[PDB]
């Protein structure tokens, strides 16, 4: 069984476990043993959960950020059902009460023994919440559908649980010996080396003398640094760049001066370098795994005596307000001087005080750490700032996690992408963040699902494959059952790749209808029917992809030839008619980030009572330039509608009326009014979202509209002004908002109000977007690489301004967009 499980993990994670063994690396070995123990202990806990707690683990509630309604309810075993009129304000318990009373009459004769499953989904309705607080009920109310629910007894829930079981003394100047290298170039070679603590240099950079490009180079020289050995902070990073000159970058490499057990490194090291794009302090501190091909630098660290970093107890032994809302040297001195008062009276200003301490002085670090150990916990917002690479110290990192422990699962989910990216800044394998993420993941299966996919989707990236593979292994140790569920998803993804490759080849030699039929024959093979059917959606575990609907599957006969894959489920009814788009060829990371930021905007708006009728469709990278996008049914591109085809319900005398005609055709009579409203609200949301994020090149073929009237965007390729992008008002959109009238200032200005409201709400959470984007710099997205990218967001949110000035500014941009509008 252990052999089987080991082979299943290897397959699932995309790395053979033997590859970890082969490294013969103590840090790896220790990570694996400790984290396996941690995760297996979490699994033990989980298997004795009460039935309500089990639901909370496996089916966490989907909640929104008087009035009558019809609900259909059945019991688990029978096809018979009852349709009830209840209120939007009624609790699930009241509904379960009517259900059980109805069963007792028909069956000839305790609500608390049950939970309500959404038919054909892994989603449950339970808890003390009015029906309209549940995302599912909320959803039905807007679309018009009747909720379909299933009474599931506690014994059935426990059955699911059960089936799913498993020093201060060293004053000499720091120095190294640069021995030799082995590289490839055209000129002379130089080695630059700097000592870093996060972004900050701990002293000046020091260089080699110029040696000819032939080699196989040899230096054999001591490089001495302007910093005493006792002063080196715990997280000291030593960074190298090898380059050529008559500037031609060649390679770089970083390492920690202390190992994972706090011991100062000695003596010789061989540094397998990473190829270059000079110094890259934020780069990984682990060597290039391609030892066959990588240029290599051998260095020597001298035997200073074995010395370890001092223990905490030994460390513990050893105009203010006007600025405190970049600073001058004298301002820095004041902050440091008043550090006790910072702690006592401005605990939320911790980050500012950290950035003024001299991390290149051990006495000063000791004094900072003493305060930190008594520092009150900070809000979540503040803790996210502390995760930035600017705060490399391990005690600071540990403090950050401690303040982040109060994250709700929903908040954690919202920030998961960024917390995963921050792993790329970690100096060691065993760290507080990994342990935090693993514990949260093991306590909430939705968190576990997305953590898995965020890690799995980067396994083709050498710099993270080891770290991410190890985390995924540990996760599997803590849920054997979820491993098998994830393997089923991976198998479907493997088949989709093979199917897409086939389509790419076939469409080059034949017509689309011919390739489409061939696609269908391929899918109808037993191996494909089996692999593609009956899985949890990678885009949403709550969504069940039962039988694949081959007849309705197709592909886009352009660009990367993405696949359109439809599903149906008898048990889910209408809500089981769902699709996924599989794309191979494009890197989906920036799309996912853009969509997640838009979904965050939607949450913040809803928290202030503004529902802009957004369409946060799923987007998930799964592999190398591979991922999935959630199908939005009953939608079309604006461009297709504007084709203004004849013999259609939307056929228009003037092209400007095509879109309104289409919306009329989908929403006859009194329904037109609501559709125009959904269009106006969503238009405002996306107009504000794309403006703030700096997303240009919006055109008719990358905007879609739903039959409800809701607009949404696709094919984000560019953001943060990498194409200062203007606010955008399209005339055809204004025309719909104005109900087809040439002048309708009443409607148009309501729309302006929505835009301004949306914008002012985002400004109030501006620091959240800035902290999240800062963390995202870890991802290495080329459009999010430097300060100039972050500065775009600062300028778009106008955070240096009063709300009055910002709104004035926004108004000028909005007014400029309206004029531009024909
Ligand atoms: C209705 O879908 C379309 C309408 C007009 C033009 C293109 C599409 N469309 C689109 C438009 S993008 C889209 N379409 C539907 N739901 C979505 N969710 C996120 N993006 C979308 N995408 C495809 C992806 C794979 C295979 C196909 Cl066959 C398509 C596809 O037809």
Automatic annotation (TrEMBL):
GO terms for biological process, alphabetical? adaptive immune response; B cell activation; cell differentiation; cell surface receptor signaling pathway; chemotaxis; inflammatory response; innate immune response; phosphatidylinositol 3-kinase/protein kinase B signal transduction
Q: Where is the signal peptide?
A: none
Q: Which reaction does it catalyse?
A: 1-octadecanoyl-2-(5Z,8Z,11Z,14Z)-eicosatetraenoyl-sn-glycero-3-phospho-1D-myo-inositol 4,5-bisphosphate + ATP = 1-octadecanoyl-2-(5Z,8Z,11Z,14Z-eicosatetraenoyl)-sn-glycero-3-phospho-(1D-myo-inositol 3,4,5-triphosphate) + ADP + H(+); a 1,2-diacyl-sn-glycero-3-phospho-(1D-myo-inositol-4,5-bisphosphate) + ATP = a 1,2-diacyl-sn-glycero-3-phospho-(1D-myo-inositol-3,4,5-trisphosphate) + ADP + H(+); a 1,2-diacyl-sn-glycero-3-phospho-(1D-myo-inositol) + ATP = a 1,2-diacyl-sn-glycero-3-phospho-(1D-myo-inositol-3-phosphate) + ADP + H(+)
Q: Which UniProt keywords apply?
A: Adaptive immunity, ATP-binding, Chemotaxis, Cytoplasm, Differentiation, Immunity, Inflammatory response, Innate immunity, Kinase, Lipid metabolism, Nucleotide-binding, Phosphoprotein, Transferase
Domain named PI3K/PI4K catalytic: which ranges? 549-822
Report domain C2 PI3K-type positions.
170-302
Q: In which pathway does it act?
A: Lipid metabolism; Phospholipid metabolism; phosphatidylinositol phosphate biosynthesis
What Pfam families would the database entry show?
PI3_PI4_kinase, PI3K_C2, PI3K_p85B, PI3K_rbd, PI3Ka
> Domain PIK helical, which positions?
319-478
What EC number(s) has UniProt assigned to this enzyme? 2.7.1.137, 2.7.1.153
Q: Which residues belong to any copy of the PI3K-RBD domain?
A: 66-153
Coiled-coil parts of chain: none
Q: What are the GO MF terms of this UniProt record?
A: 1-phosphatidylinositol-3-kinase activity; 1-phosphatidylinositol-4,5-bisphosphate 3-kinase activity; ATP binding
GO cellular component, alphabetical, reads: cytosol
Compartments annotated for it: namely: Cytoplasm
Which Gene3D superfamilies does the annotation name?
Answer: 3.10.20.770, C2 domain, Phosphatidylinositol 3-/4-kinase, catalytic domain, Phosphatidylinositol 3-kinase Catalytic Subunit, Chain A, domain 4, Phosphatidylinositol 3-kinase, accessory domain (PIK)
The source's superkingdom equals Eukaryota
Write out the similarity annotation. Answer: Belongs to the PI3/PI4-kinase family. Type III PI4K subfamily.
Record protein name field: Phosphatidylinositol 4,5-bisphosphate 3-kinase catalytic subunit delta isoform
The scientific name of the source species is Mus musculus
Upper lineage is: Eukaryota, Metazoa, Chordata, Craniata, Vertebrata
């Amino acid at each position: 069984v252990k052999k089987l499980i080991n082979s299943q993990i290897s397959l699932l994670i995309g790395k053979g476990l033997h590859e970890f063994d082969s490294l013969r690396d103590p840090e790896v070995n220790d990570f694996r043993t400790k984290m396996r123990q941690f995760c297996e202990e979490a699994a033990a806990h989980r298997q004795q959960l009460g039935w309500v707690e089990w639901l909370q683990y496996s089916f966490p509630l989907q909640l929104e950020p008087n009035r009558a309604l019809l609900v259909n309810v059945k019991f688990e075993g029978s096809e018979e059902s009852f349709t009830f009129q209840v209120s939007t304000k009624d609790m699930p318990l009241a509904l379960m009460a009517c259900a059980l009373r109805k069963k007792a009459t028909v069956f000839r004769q305790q609500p608390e023994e049950y939970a309500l499953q959404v038919n054909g989904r892994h989603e449950y309705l339970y808890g003390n919440y009015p029906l309209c607080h549940f995302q599912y009920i909320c959803s039905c109310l807007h679309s018009g559908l009747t909720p379909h629910l299933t009474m599931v007894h506690s014994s059935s829930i426990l059955a699911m649980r059960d089936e799913q079981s498993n020093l201060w003394s060293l004053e000499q100047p720091f120095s190294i010996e640069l021995i030799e290298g082995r590289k490839v170039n055209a000129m002379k070679l130089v080695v630059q080396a700097g000592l870093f603590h996060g972004n900050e240099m701990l002293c000046k950079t020091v260089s080699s003398s110029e040696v000819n490009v032939c080699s196989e180079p040899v230096w054999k020289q001591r490089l001495e640094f302007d910093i005493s050995v006792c002063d080196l902070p715990r997280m000291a990073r030593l960074c190298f760049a090898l380059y050529a000159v008559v500037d031609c970058p060649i390679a770089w490499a970083n390492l920690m001066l202390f190992d994972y057990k706090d011991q100062l490194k000695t003596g010789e090291r061989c540094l397998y370098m990473w190829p270059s794009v000079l110094l890259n302090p934020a780069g990984t501190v682990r060597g290039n795994p391609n030892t066959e091909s990588a240029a290599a630098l051998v260095i020597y660290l001298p035997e200073v005596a074995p010395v370890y970093f001092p223990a905490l107890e030994k460390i513990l032994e050893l105009l203010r307000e006007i600025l405190e809302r970049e600073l001058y040297e004298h301002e820095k001195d004041l902050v440091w001087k008043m550090r006790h008062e910072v702690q006592e009276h401005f605990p939320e200003a911790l980050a500012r005080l950290l950035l003024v301490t001299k991390w290149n002085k051990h006495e000063d670090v000791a004094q900072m750490l003493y305060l930190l150990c008594s520092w009150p916990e900070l809000p979540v917002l503040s803790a996210l700032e502390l995760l930035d690479f600017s705060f490399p110290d391990c005690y600071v990192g540990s403090f950050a996690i401690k303040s982040l422990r109060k994250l709700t699962d929903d908040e954690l989910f919202q920030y998961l992408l960024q917390l995963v990216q921050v792993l790329k800044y970690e100096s060691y394998l065993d760290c507080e963040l990994t342990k935090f993420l693993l514990g949260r993941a093991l306590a909430n299966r939705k968190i576990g699902h997305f953590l898995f996919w965020h890690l799995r989707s980067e396994m083709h990236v050498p710099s993270v494959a080891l770290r991410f593979g190890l985390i995924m292994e540990a996760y599997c140790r803590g849920s054997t059952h979820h491993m098998k569920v994830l393997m089923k998803q991976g198998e479907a993804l493997s088949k989709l790749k093979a199917l897409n490759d086939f389509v790419k080849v076939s469409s080059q030699k034949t017509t689309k209808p011919q390739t489409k039929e061939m696609m269908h024959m391929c899918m109808r093979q037993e191996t494909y029917m089996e692999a593609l059917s009956h899985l949890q959606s990678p885009l949403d575990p709550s969504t069940l992809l039962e039988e694949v609907c081959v007849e309705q599957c197709t592909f886009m006969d352009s660009k990367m030839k993405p696949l359109w894959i439809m599903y149906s489920s008898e048990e889910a009814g209408s809500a089981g008619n769902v699709g996924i788009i599989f794309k191979n060829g494009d890197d989906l990371r920036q799309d996912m980030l853009t969509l997640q930021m838009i979904q965050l905007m939607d949450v913040l708006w809803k928290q202030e009572g503004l529902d802009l009728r957004m369409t946060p469709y799923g987007c998930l990278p799964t592999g190398d330039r591979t991922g999935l996008i959630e199908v939005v049914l009953h939608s079309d591109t604006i461009a297709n509608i504007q084709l203004n085809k004849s013999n259609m319900a939307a056929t228009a005398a003037f092209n400007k009326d095509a879109l309104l005609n289409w919306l009329k055709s989908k929403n006859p009579g009194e329904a037109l009014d609501r559709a125009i409203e959904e269009f106006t609200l969503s238009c405002a949301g996306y107009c504000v979202a794309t403006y703030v994020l700096g997303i240009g090149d919006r055109h008719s073929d990358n905007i879609m509209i739903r039959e409800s009237g809701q607009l949404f965007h696709i094919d984000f390729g560019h953001f943060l002004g990498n194409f200062r992008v203007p606010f955008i008002l399209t005339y055809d959109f204004v025309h719909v908002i104005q109900q087809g009238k040439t002048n309708n200032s009443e409607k148009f200005e309501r729309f302006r109000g929505y835009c301004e409201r949306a914008y002012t709400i985002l400004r109030r959470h501006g620091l959240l977007f800035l902290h999240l984007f800062a963390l995202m710099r870890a991802a290495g997205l080329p459009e999010l690489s430097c300060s100039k990218d972050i500065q775009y967001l600062k300028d778009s949110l106008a955070l240096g301004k009063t709300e009055e000035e910002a709104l004035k500014h926004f108004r000028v941009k909005f007014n400029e967009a309206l004029r531009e509008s024909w």
